[PDB]
Short mmCIF file of N, CA and C in Angstrom, two decimals:
data_model
loop_
_atom_site.label_atom_id
_atom_site.label_comp_id
_atom_site.label_asym_id
_atom_site.label_seq_id
_atom_site.Cartn_x
_atom_site.Cartn_y
_atom_site.Cartn_z
N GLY A 1 159.05 122.70 4.77
CA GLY A 1 160.03 122.70 5.84
C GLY A 1 161.45 122.71 5.32
N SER A 2 162.42 122.63 6.23
CA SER A 2 163.82 122.67 5.86
C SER A 2 164.61 121.68 6.70
N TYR A 3 165.61 121.06 6.08
CA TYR A 3 166.48 120.09 6.75
C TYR A 3 167.66 120.86 7.33
N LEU A 4 167.59 121.12 8.63
CA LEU A 4 168.57 121.98 9.29
C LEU A 4 169.69 121.15 9.89
N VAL A 5 170.92 121.60 9.67
CA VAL A 5 172.10 121.01 10.30
C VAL A 5 172.92 122.16 10.88
N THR A 6 173.44 121.96 12.08
CA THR A 6 174.24 122.99 12.74
C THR A 6 175.45 122.34 13.40
N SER A 7 176.63 122.90 13.14
CA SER A 7 177.87 122.44 13.74
C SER A 7 178.09 123.15 15.07
N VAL A 8 178.55 122.38 16.03
CA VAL A 8 178.28 122.61 17.45
C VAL A 8 179.49 122.03 18.18
N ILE B 1 171.07 95.44 21.44
CA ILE B 1 169.63 95.41 21.22
C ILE B 1 169.20 96.50 20.24
N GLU B 2 167.90 96.50 19.90
CA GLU B 2 167.38 97.40 18.89
C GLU B 2 167.82 98.84 19.16
N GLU B 3 167.47 99.37 20.32
CA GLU B 3 167.95 100.68 20.74
C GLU B 3 168.91 100.49 21.91
N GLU B 4 170.19 100.82 21.70
CA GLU B 4 171.13 100.90 22.80
C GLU B 4 171.04 102.29 23.41
N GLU B 5 170.86 102.36 24.72
CA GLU B 5 170.81 103.64 25.42
C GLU B 5 172.16 103.89 26.08
N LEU B 6 172.85 104.93 25.63
CA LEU B 6 174.17 105.25 26.15
C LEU B 6 174.16 106.64 26.78
N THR B 7 175.02 106.82 27.78
CA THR B 7 175.26 108.13 28.40
C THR B 7 176.71 108.50 28.09
N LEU B 8 176.87 109.55 27.29
CA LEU B 8 178.17 109.97 26.78
C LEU B 8 178.44 111.39 27.25
N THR B 9 179.68 111.65 27.64
CA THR B 9 180.07 112.93 28.22
C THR B 9 181.21 113.51 27.41
N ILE B 10 180.94 114.63 26.74
CA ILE B 10 181.90 115.28 25.87
C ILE B 10 182.65 116.33 26.68
N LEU B 11 183.98 116.29 26.63
CA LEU B 11 184.81 117.31 27.25
C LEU B 11 184.97 118.45 26.25
N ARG B 12 184.31 119.57 26.53
CA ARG B 12 184.20 120.63 25.54
C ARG B 12 185.57 121.18 25.15
N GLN B 13 185.64 121.67 23.91
CA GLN B 13 186.81 122.33 23.35
C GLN B 13 186.49 123.76 22.96
N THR B 14 187.54 124.57 22.92
CA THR B 14 187.38 125.94 22.47
C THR B 14 186.80 125.99 21.06
N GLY B 15 186.99 124.93 20.27
CA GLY B 15 186.33 124.81 18.99
C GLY B 15 184.96 124.19 19.05
N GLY B 16 184.53 123.78 20.24
CA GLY B 16 183.20 123.23 20.41
C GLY B 16 183.19 121.76 20.77
N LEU B 17 182.16 121.05 20.31
CA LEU B 17 181.97 119.65 20.65
C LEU B 17 182.36 118.69 19.53
N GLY B 18 182.54 119.19 18.31
CA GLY B 18 182.90 118.33 17.20
C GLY B 18 181.76 117.46 16.71
N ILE B 19 180.54 118.01 16.67
CA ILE B 19 179.39 117.31 16.13
C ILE B 19 178.54 118.30 15.36
N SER B 20 177.72 117.77 14.45
CA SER B 20 176.62 118.51 13.86
C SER B 20 175.33 117.80 14.23
N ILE B 21 174.28 118.57 14.50
CA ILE B 21 172.98 118.00 14.83
C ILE B 21 171.98 118.37 13.74
N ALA B 22 171.03 117.48 13.52
CA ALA B 22 169.95 117.68 12.56
C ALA B 22 168.62 117.43 13.25
N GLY B 23 167.55 117.94 12.66
CA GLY B 23 166.22 117.67 13.15
C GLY B 23 165.68 118.76 14.05
N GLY B 24 164.55 118.45 14.67
CA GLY B 24 163.87 119.37 15.56
C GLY B 24 162.41 119.55 15.17
N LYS B 25 161.59 119.88 16.17
CA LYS B 25 160.17 120.11 15.94
C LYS B 25 159.97 121.17 14.87
N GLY B 26 159.21 120.82 13.84
CA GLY B 26 158.91 121.74 12.77
C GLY B 26 159.88 121.72 11.61
N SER B 27 160.99 121.01 11.74
CA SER B 27 161.99 120.89 10.69
C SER B 27 161.80 119.57 9.95
N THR B 28 162.58 119.39 8.89
CA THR B 28 162.53 118.15 8.12
C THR B 28 163.18 117.03 8.93
N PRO B 29 162.50 115.90 9.12
CA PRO B 29 163.06 114.84 9.97
C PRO B 29 164.39 114.31 9.44
N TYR B 30 165.28 113.98 10.39
CA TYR B 30 166.51 113.28 10.04
C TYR B 30 166.21 111.90 9.47
N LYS B 31 165.18 111.24 9.99
CA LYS B 31 164.82 109.91 9.52
C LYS B 31 163.34 109.68 9.76
N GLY B 32 162.71 108.93 8.85
CA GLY B 32 161.30 108.63 8.98
C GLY B 32 160.48 109.89 9.18
N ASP B 33 159.56 109.84 10.15
CA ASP B 33 158.77 111.00 10.55
C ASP B 33 159.18 111.52 11.92
N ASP B 34 160.39 111.19 12.37
CA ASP B 34 160.85 111.50 13.71
C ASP B 34 161.44 112.90 13.72
N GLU B 35 160.81 113.80 14.47
CA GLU B 35 161.27 115.18 14.57
C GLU B 35 162.34 115.38 15.64
N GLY B 36 162.90 114.30 16.16
CA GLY B 36 163.89 114.40 17.22
C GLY B 36 165.20 115.00 16.73
N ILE B 37 166.11 115.17 17.69
CA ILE B 37 167.44 115.71 17.43
C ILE B 37 168.39 114.54 17.23
N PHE B 38 169.13 114.55 16.12
CA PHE B 38 170.03 113.46 15.79
C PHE B 38 171.42 114.00 15.49
N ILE B 39 172.43 113.17 15.78
CA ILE B 39 173.80 113.46 15.39
C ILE B 39 173.93 113.16 13.90
N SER B 40 174.23 114.19 13.11
CA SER B 40 174.40 114.02 11.67
C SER B 40 175.86 113.96 11.24
N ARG B 41 176.78 114.41 12.08
CA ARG B 41 178.20 114.41 11.75
C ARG B 41 179.00 114.37 13.04
N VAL B 42 180.10 113.63 13.02
CA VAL B 42 181.03 113.57 14.15
C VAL B 42 182.42 113.86 13.60
N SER B 43 183.06 114.90 14.12
CA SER B 43 184.40 115.26 13.68
C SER B 43 185.38 114.17 14.11
N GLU B 44 186.13 113.64 13.15
CA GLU B 44 187.13 112.63 13.46
C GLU B 44 188.12 113.18 14.46
N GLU B 45 188.40 112.39 15.49
CA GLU B 45 189.36 112.74 16.53
C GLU B 45 188.98 114.03 17.27
N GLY B 46 187.71 114.40 17.23
CA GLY B 46 187.22 115.53 17.98
C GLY B 46 186.68 115.12 19.33
N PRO B 47 186.17 116.09 20.10
CA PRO B 47 185.71 115.75 21.46
C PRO B 47 184.58 114.73 21.50
N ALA B 48 183.58 114.86 20.63
CA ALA B 48 182.47 113.91 20.63
C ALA B 48 182.94 112.52 20.21
N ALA B 49 183.84 112.45 19.23
CA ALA B 49 184.42 111.17 18.84
C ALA B 49 185.12 110.52 20.03
N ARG B 50 185.97 111.27 20.73
CA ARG B 50 186.64 110.71 21.90
C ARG B 50 185.64 110.24 22.95
N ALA B 51 184.47 110.88 23.03
CA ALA B 51 183.45 110.49 23.99
C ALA B 51 182.61 109.31 23.53
N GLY B 52 182.74 108.89 22.27
CA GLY B 52 182.01 107.75 21.77
C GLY B 52 180.72 108.06 21.05
N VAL B 53 180.49 109.32 20.69
CA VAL B 53 179.29 109.71 19.96
C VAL B 53 179.42 109.26 18.51
N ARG B 54 178.30 108.88 17.91
CA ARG B 54 178.31 108.40 16.54
C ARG B 54 177.17 109.01 15.73
N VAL B 55 177.41 109.11 14.41
CA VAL B 55 176.38 109.56 13.49
C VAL B 55 175.16 108.68 13.64
N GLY B 56 173.98 109.30 13.66
CA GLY B 56 172.74 108.58 13.80
C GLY B 56 172.22 108.48 15.21
N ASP B 57 173.04 108.79 16.22
CA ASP B 57 172.58 108.77 17.59
C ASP B 57 171.44 109.78 17.76
N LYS B 58 170.39 109.36 18.47
CA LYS B 58 169.26 110.22 18.77
C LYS B 58 169.48 110.83 20.15
N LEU B 59 169.41 112.16 20.23
CA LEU B 59 169.72 112.89 21.45
C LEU B 59 168.44 113.04 22.27
N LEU B 60 168.40 112.39 23.44
CA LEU B 60 167.22 112.44 24.28
C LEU B 60 167.31 113.48 25.38
N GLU B 61 168.51 113.73 25.90
CA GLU B 61 168.70 114.53 27.10
C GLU B 61 170.09 115.14 27.04
N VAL B 62 170.19 116.40 27.44
CA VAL B 62 171.46 117.11 27.49
C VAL B 62 171.57 117.74 28.87
N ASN B 63 172.63 117.39 29.60
CA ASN B 63 172.87 117.90 30.94
C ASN B 63 171.61 117.79 31.80
N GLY B 64 170.97 116.63 31.74
CA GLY B 64 169.86 116.32 32.61
C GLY B 64 168.53 116.91 32.22
N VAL B 65 168.44 117.57 31.07
CA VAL B 65 167.19 118.17 30.61
C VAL B 65 166.78 117.50 29.31
N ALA B 66 165.54 117.02 29.27
CA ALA B 66 165.02 116.36 28.08
C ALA B 66 164.91 117.36 26.93
N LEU B 67 165.16 116.86 25.72
CA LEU B 67 164.95 117.62 24.49
C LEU B 67 163.63 117.28 23.83
N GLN B 68 162.74 116.60 24.56
CA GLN B 68 161.45 116.21 24.01
C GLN B 68 160.70 117.44 23.50
N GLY B 69 160.33 117.41 22.22
CA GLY B 69 159.62 118.51 21.61
C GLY B 69 160.49 119.68 21.23
N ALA B 70 161.80 119.56 21.34
CA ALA B 70 162.68 120.71 21.11
C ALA B 70 162.72 121.08 19.63
N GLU B 71 162.63 122.37 19.36
CA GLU B 71 162.96 122.89 18.05
C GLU B 71 164.48 122.86 17.86
N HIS B 72 164.90 122.89 16.60
CA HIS B 72 166.33 122.82 16.29
C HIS B 72 167.11 123.87 17.08
N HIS B 73 166.60 125.10 17.12
CA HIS B 73 167.35 126.17 17.78
C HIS B 73 167.52 125.91 19.27
N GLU B 74 166.54 125.27 19.92
CA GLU B 74 166.71 124.96 21.34
C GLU B 74 167.87 123.98 21.53
N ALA B 75 167.93 122.94 20.70
CA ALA B 75 169.01 121.96 20.80
C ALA B 75 170.36 122.63 20.57
N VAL B 76 170.44 123.52 19.58
CA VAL B 76 171.68 124.25 19.33
C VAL B 76 172.08 125.05 20.56
N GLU B 77 171.12 125.79 21.13
CA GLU B 77 171.40 126.59 22.32
C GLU B 77 171.85 125.71 23.48
N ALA B 78 171.21 124.54 23.64
CA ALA B 78 171.56 123.66 24.74
C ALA B 78 172.99 123.15 24.63
N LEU B 79 173.51 123.03 23.41
CA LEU B 79 174.85 122.50 23.18
C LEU B 79 175.90 123.60 23.05
N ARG B 80 175.50 124.86 23.08
CA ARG B 80 176.43 125.98 22.99
C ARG B 80 176.56 126.72 24.32
N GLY B 81 176.35 126.02 25.43
CA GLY B 81 176.47 126.61 26.75
C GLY B 81 177.91 126.70 27.23
N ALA B 82 178.05 127.15 28.47
CA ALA B 82 179.36 127.48 29.01
C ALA B 82 180.05 126.31 29.71
N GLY B 83 179.36 125.19 29.91
CA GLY B 83 179.93 124.11 30.69
C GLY B 83 181.08 123.43 29.96
N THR B 84 182.12 123.07 30.73
CA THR B 84 183.27 122.39 30.16
C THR B 84 182.99 120.93 29.82
N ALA B 85 181.82 120.42 30.18
CA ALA B 85 181.43 119.05 29.86
C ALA B 85 179.96 119.04 29.47
N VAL B 86 179.62 118.19 28.50
CA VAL B 86 178.25 118.04 28.03
C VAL B 86 177.89 116.56 28.17
N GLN B 87 177.00 116.26 29.10
CA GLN B 87 176.47 114.91 29.26
C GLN B 87 175.24 114.78 28.37
N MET B 88 175.20 113.71 27.57
CA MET B 88 174.04 113.44 26.73
C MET B 88 173.66 111.97 26.82
N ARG B 89 172.36 111.72 26.93
CA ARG B 89 171.81 110.38 26.83
C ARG B 89 171.26 110.20 25.42
N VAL B 90 171.69 109.14 24.75
CA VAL B 90 171.33 108.93 23.35
C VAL B 90 170.77 107.52 23.18
N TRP B 91 169.95 107.36 22.15
CA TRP B 91 169.52 106.04 21.69
C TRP B 91 170.21 105.76 20.36
N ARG B 92 170.80 104.57 20.26
CA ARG B 92 171.59 104.17 19.10
C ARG B 92 170.98 102.90 18.53
N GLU B 93 170.55 102.95 17.28
CA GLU B 93 169.94 101.79 16.64
C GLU B 93 171.05 100.86 16.15
N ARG B 94 171.07 99.64 16.68
CA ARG B 94 172.08 98.66 16.30
C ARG B 94 171.51 97.72 15.25
#
């Protein structure tokens, strides 16, 4: 899996 | 208490909400084995900061719709809508 971060 | 449940309302900016979110179904958990959506960053003096959002808050509901089972992309889409205000219910571990 992947540790996803998104700026919003 | 252990989980404080807060309802926070962000007044949107042309630059956005001033937060980063992590997590989601199928992604690497923000903490433990919890696949929920969490606040991973809050822009200082940004809209979410002014609304009282904090790093580590668990996002349960956005504009009256639960994020239960949401993949990361759904949460991103839910927070990139057209509304000038974003109401979110969060759980905050004290």
